[PDB]
Amino acid sequence: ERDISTEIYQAGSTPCNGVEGFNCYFPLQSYGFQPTNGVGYQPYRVVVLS
Amino acid sequence: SVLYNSASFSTFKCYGVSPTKLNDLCFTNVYADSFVIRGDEVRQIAPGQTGKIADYNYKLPDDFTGCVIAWNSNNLDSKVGGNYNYLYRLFRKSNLKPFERDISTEIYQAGSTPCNGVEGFNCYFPLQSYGFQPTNGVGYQPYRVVVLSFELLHAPATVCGPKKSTNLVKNKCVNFNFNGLTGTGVLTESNKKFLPFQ
Amino acid sequence: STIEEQAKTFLDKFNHEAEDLFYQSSLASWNYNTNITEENVQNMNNAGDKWSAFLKEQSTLAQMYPLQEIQNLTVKLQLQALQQNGSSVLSEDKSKRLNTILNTMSTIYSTGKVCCLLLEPGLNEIMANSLDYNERLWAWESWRSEVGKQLRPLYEEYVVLKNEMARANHYEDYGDYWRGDYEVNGVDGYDYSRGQLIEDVEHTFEEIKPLYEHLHAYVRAKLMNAYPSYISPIGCLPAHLLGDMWGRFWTNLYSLTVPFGQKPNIDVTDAMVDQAWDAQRIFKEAEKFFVSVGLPNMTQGFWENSMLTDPGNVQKAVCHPTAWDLGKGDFRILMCTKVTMDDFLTAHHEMGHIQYDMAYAAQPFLLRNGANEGFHEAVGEIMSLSAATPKHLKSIGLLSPDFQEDNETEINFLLKQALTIVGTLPFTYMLEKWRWMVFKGEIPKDQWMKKWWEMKREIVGVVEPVPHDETYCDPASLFHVSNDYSFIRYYTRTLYQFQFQEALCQAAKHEGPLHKCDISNSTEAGQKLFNMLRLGKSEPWTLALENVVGAKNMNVRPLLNYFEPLFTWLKDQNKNSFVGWSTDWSPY
Numbered sequence: 001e002r003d004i005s006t007e008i009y010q011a012g013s014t015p016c017n018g019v020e021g022f023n024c025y026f027p028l029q030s031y032g033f034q035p036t037n038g039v040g041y042q043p044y045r046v047v048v049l050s
Numbered sequence: 051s052v053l054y055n056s057a058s059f060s061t062f063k064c065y066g067v068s069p070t071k072l073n074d075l076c077f078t079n080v081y082a083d084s085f086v087i088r089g090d091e092v093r094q095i096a097p098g099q100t101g102k103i104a105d106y107n108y109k110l111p112d113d114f115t116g117c118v119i120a121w122n123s124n125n126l127d128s129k130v131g132g133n134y135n136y137l138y139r140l141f142r143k144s145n146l147k148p149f150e151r152d153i154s155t156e157i158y159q160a161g162s163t164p165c166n167g168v169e170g171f172n173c174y175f176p177l178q179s180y181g182f183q184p185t186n187g188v189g190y191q192p193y194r195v196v197v198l199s200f201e202l203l204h205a206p207a208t209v210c211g212p213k214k215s216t217n218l219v220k221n222k223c224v225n226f227n228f229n230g231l232t233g234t235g236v237l238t239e240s241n242k243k244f245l246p247f248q
Numbered sequence: 249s250t251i252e253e254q255a256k257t258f259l260d261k262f263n264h265e266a267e268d269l270f271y272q273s274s275l276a277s278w279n280y281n282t283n284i285t286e287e288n289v290q291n292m293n294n295a296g297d298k299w300s301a302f303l304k305e306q307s308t309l310a311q312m313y314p315l316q317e318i319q320n321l322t323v324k325l326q327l328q329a330l331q332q333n334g335s336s337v338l339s340e341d342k343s344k345r346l347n348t349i350l351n352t353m354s355t356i357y358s359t360g361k362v363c364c365l366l367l368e369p370g371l372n373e374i375m376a377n378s379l380d381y382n383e384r385l386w387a388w389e390s391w392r393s394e395v396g397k398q399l400r401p402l403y404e405e406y407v408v409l410k411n412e413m414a415r416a417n418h419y420e421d422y423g424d425y426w427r428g429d430y431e432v433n434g435v436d437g438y439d440y441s442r443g444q445l446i447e448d449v450e451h452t453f454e455e456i457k458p459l460y461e462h463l464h465a466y467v468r469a470k471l472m473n474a475y476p477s478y479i480s481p482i483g484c485l486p487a488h489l490l491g492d493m494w495g496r497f498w499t500n501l502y503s504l505t506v507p508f509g510q511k512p513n514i515d516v517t518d519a520m521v522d523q524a525w526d527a528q529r530i531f532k533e534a535e536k537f538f539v540s541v542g543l544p545n546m547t548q549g550f551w552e553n554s555m556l557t558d559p560g561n562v563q564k565a566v567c568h569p570t571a572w573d574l575g576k577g578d579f580r581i582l583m584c585t586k587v588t589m590d591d592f593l594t595a596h597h598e599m600g601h602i603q604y605d606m607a608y609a610a611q612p613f614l615l616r617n618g619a620n621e622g623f624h625e626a627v628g629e630i631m632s633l634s635a636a637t638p639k640h641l642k643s644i645g646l647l648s649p650d651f652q653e654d655n656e657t658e659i660n661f662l663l664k665q666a667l668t669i670v671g672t673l674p675f676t677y678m679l680e681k682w683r684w685m686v687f688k689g690e691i692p693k694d695q696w697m698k699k700w701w702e703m704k705r706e707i708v709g710v711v712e713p714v715p716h717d718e719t720y721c722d723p724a725s726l727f728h729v730s731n732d733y734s735f736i737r738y739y740t741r742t743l744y745q746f747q748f749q750e751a752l753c754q755a756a757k758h759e760g761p762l763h764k765c766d767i768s769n770s771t772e773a774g775q776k777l778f779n780m781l782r783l784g785k786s787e788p789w790t791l792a793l794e795n796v797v798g799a800k801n802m803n804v805r806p807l808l809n810y811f812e813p814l815f816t817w818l819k820d821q822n823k824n825s826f827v828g829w830s831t832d833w834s835p836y
């Protein structure tokens with residue numbers, strides 16, 4: 001499965017109503033790929049064959 | 051839940067476990083740490099953070115598991131002229147350890163000046179009082195902080211739940227989950243008597 | 249360990265005490281300001297006296313810290329402020345004598361009588377209105393001849409003890425003492441030693457001068473309708489005639505000198521009185537204006553803890569527009585505010601000082617101040633000037649689409665400003681330069697008034713209508729002498745105001761002359777200003793002026809671009825008579 005949806009995630013009972021308020025979060029995060037960074041944090045390209 | 055739903059705290063954080071996921075868990079023990087600070091200091095207390103609180107008064111481990119609460123206590127421990135009965139350490143010769151506590155008032159020194167039993171030029175008493183007045187701005191207003199620390203151990207659990215009971219039903223074929231016993235069937239009343247501990 | 253560690257810990261032990269004790273003094277003073285009665289006096293006094301005795305003790309302790317080893321600068325700047333000995337460097341007998349000279353000559357200026365009339369209102373309200381040469385000459389002369397009589401003998405002895413504290417504080421003169429605050433020192437490029445304040449100020453004064461020479465010649469040519477028998481078309485202007493008893497403002501001449509007077513100035517107070525705004529609405533509109541600039545909202549306690557309206561006779565309290573900062577986040581205003589557009593813009597004026605006092609509050613106690621003595625006042629007015637424009641008043645909605653701005657209205661507008669502003673920069677530089685000459689001693693104590701009435705003709709174009717001597721002193725007959733004030737603030741305030749204006753209007757992408765510039769909704773202009781308010785005296789004003797304007801030194805061309813159409817019409821109208829003035833005339 002792939003899911004490219006960008007709707008707000010709600011972490012608690014407080015209904016987010018799309019407001020991106022309290023307990024309301026964006027479900028994506030971006031990687032810190034600076035070249036002067038540790039190898040565990042360096043990027044790796046991955047390919048899968050099926 | 052009665053804490054999570056209280057809707058009466060200006061901050062609520064949890065670490066190692068998400069705050070919604072707490073009643074569905076058990077622990078060996080819990081410990082609650084509580085103290086008063088300025089609102090301007092409330093921002094100092096998190097794992098990894100640093101500040102007069104974190105350095106000299108109270109310190110968290112960076113692998114903390116637990117939760118933190120604060121609310122403004124102005125309306126019950128500020129006063130006209132100011133409350134000076136609340137003290138913080140301004141100086142220490144070294145920073146605290148996590149969960150360290152030390153009340154000791156031994157004089158602090160800066161530069162080469164042996165203090166020889168008195169304060170003076172660069173010899174100072176290491177503690178300061180706030181002086182919470184109702185005229186103060188909220189950063190200078192007092193806040194009551196509580197920190198809950200969660201224990202897991204080789205010993206058995208002692209704090210839990212609570213669990214939720216549900217309505218009984220009879221004669222129908224149903225799934226049943228009695229006191230951790232599980233099965234399926236029909237339930238009916240019975241004549242036999244057990245002993246009271248079976 | 250290092251001295252820097254030693255100095256850090258001392259100043260930390262200062263700062264936490266200083267912010268508390270200063271608050272205790274300041275709250276008692278607010279209560280006295282809120283209730284001008286006894287016991288409020290004594291509580292204010294005792295706390296302020298003990299604050300001073302704390303501050304003097306800490307300054308005496310700060311002497312044992314060797315300043316040169318500190319590299320942090322910020323510790324150094326607090327030391328460089330705290331270690332200043334001030335008057336306490338004098339011998340106690342000379343300290344006590346100068347203290348008596350100060351208290352006495354201040355009291356005489358506060359109490360002097362002209363026979364009888366007091367200074368306020370009696371002489372002020374005469375000279376703003378009399379238009380009689382006989383009354384005006386009497387009211388001018390007698391102020392020198394009845395109270396100048398008393399101030400001059402004391403001023404002669406004040407100068408020496410002031411120079412002695414300047415010397416012992418290692419200043420070159422007691423003018424340099426005031427020049428000390430404009431000093432930037434120890435910085436590559438940004439450095440600006442005390443004496444550098446004589447330069448640029450004289451360089452810009454010689455540059456603004458033509459606009460005032462054309463104003464003076466227009467005013468003279470126009471006012472000869474009022475004073476035909478008393479003014480020469482070629483001479484200087486007689487110091488008694490010019491709408492003031494000192495002549496430091498011509499702003500009262502405005503009603504006689506409007507060229508297009510059949511076009512009234514812009515106002516919307518009538519719509520605000522019609523809509524019955526209740527002063528609290530005005531501070532609410534002032535908040536919405538600051539919010540429209542992107543500046544933050546009033547704090548909750550401000551609204552009740554401040555005084556935003558006249559208390560009435562049931563609560564005795566002297567009141568004028570006054571930004572109040574107490575510390576501990578306690579901000580307030582005191583004003584007996586009323587339903588006018590000038591209360592509105594003075595609310596903005598004080599709120600600018602509220603914002604500046606808030607932004608650098610992140611700095612330590614001594615650095616919680618403006619980057620120079622004039623920057624704080626310039627910041628105050630620039631949020632007034634930005635809101636004063638008819639474009640904003642149209643955005644306020646209270647300005648009807650009827651009678652929009654036009655040149656005939658705006659020349660009337662700028663004229664009164666010029667009579668308020670560019671008429672005063674000559675007088676400001678006059679006294680400050682003459683004071684530089686007195687404190688340096690270029691002129692002995694008998695030449696003072698004779699050099700004065702020479703430079704009054706070169707600088708201001710103003711002349712003695714009847715001569716005065718060593719029994720008199722026109723300088724010492726004025727507040728900034730009689731109350732020991734750095735006066736150059738007025739000069740620098742003005743140029744910084746328009747320098748910041750041009751920078752803020754360029755950010756607002758203003759068009760044409762700067763009179764129709766509006767900074768509301770141009771949030772970037774506010775944030776570009778706010779990042780300077782955030783610094784205060786923690787960083788050189790020669791850097792903060794680079795941050796706003798980019799001008800690493802003082803510039804006056806933005807002012808000429810504000811008065812730009814007024815200067816055009818002065819030049820065009822000046823040929824109604826001789827252009828400029830000549831030194832070689834006085835009425836006698």
Ligand SMILES: [Zn+2]
Nearest residue numbers: 624625628629
């Ligand atoms: Zn001001």
